[PDB]
């Protein structure tokens with residue numbers, strides 16, 4: 337394993353504790369609400385991703401390379417990749433813990449697909465099934481954690497952000513992480529000459545699914561259907 | 572975004 341990939345794996349959060357805190361927050365603010373005041377299933381998912389955004393920010397906040405940029409550069413990177421990290425984390429959770437016909441939430445709760453599908457609507461189901469199709473290919477490619485953290489840093493240190501005062505590091509990490517992933521998939525996965533290319537090509541698809549998820553959630557917010565998640569959705 | 576800057580500046 338390249339030592340750069342080892343450095344990326346250290347900034348990974350304590351997932352059992354992240355899931356425990358999010359579940360406790362929702363179990364609090366849900367059983368606390370009145371009978372005529374319970375959250376909808378779409379509302380529960382919005383609060384889950386809102387809490388997930390908090391741990392996403394704290395993850396990058398203490399991650400290597402990222403903790404060297406000034407706060408202005410940190411905000412620009414996160415405001416460009418926040419929905420992609422949510423989709424990437426959701427997709428990887430279904431690759432690891434996922435079972436067929438089931439969706440695993442950030443709280444560790446397993447939901448059957450056809451129940452969520454009845455309430456997601458036309459657009460979300462197409463966005464969810466497209467993401468589930470990406471889960472199927474990543475599963476067939478043996479998508480592991482070492483390649484998951486590099487894809488996270490490739491999304492975080494996106495070349496699609498500007499007004500950066502230190503674009504040299506963002507560009508430097510992008511090329512450097514890309515070279516480490518190419519070396520990892522080659523050394524640890526011969527047999528699969530298609531894996532490295534197939535891995536990077538999900539990024540435009542994750543970028544497209546996430547950007548289409550933003551435009552629908554913004555559509556839902558203007559209709560009065562949805563607060564860190566909302567402030568990230570603006571501008 | 573005051574909330575995002577706060578999450579990156581708080582202790």
Ligand SMILES: CCCCCCC1=C(c2ccccc2)[C@]2(CN(C)c3ccccc3)CC[C@H](NS(N)(=O)=O)[C@@H]2C1
Pocket residue numbers: 377378380381382384385388419422423426440441442443452455456460463464465467545546549550553
């Ligand atoms: C009524 C059914 C509601 C949807 C159930 C499936 C989920 C998502 C998803 C995943 C892939 C494709 C389309 C949707 C998320 C959708 N959101 C909140 C989101 C918001 C902004 C940007 C990007 C995503 C993204 C990940 C999150 N999962 S969660 N609850 O564990 O934290 C949500 C739950």
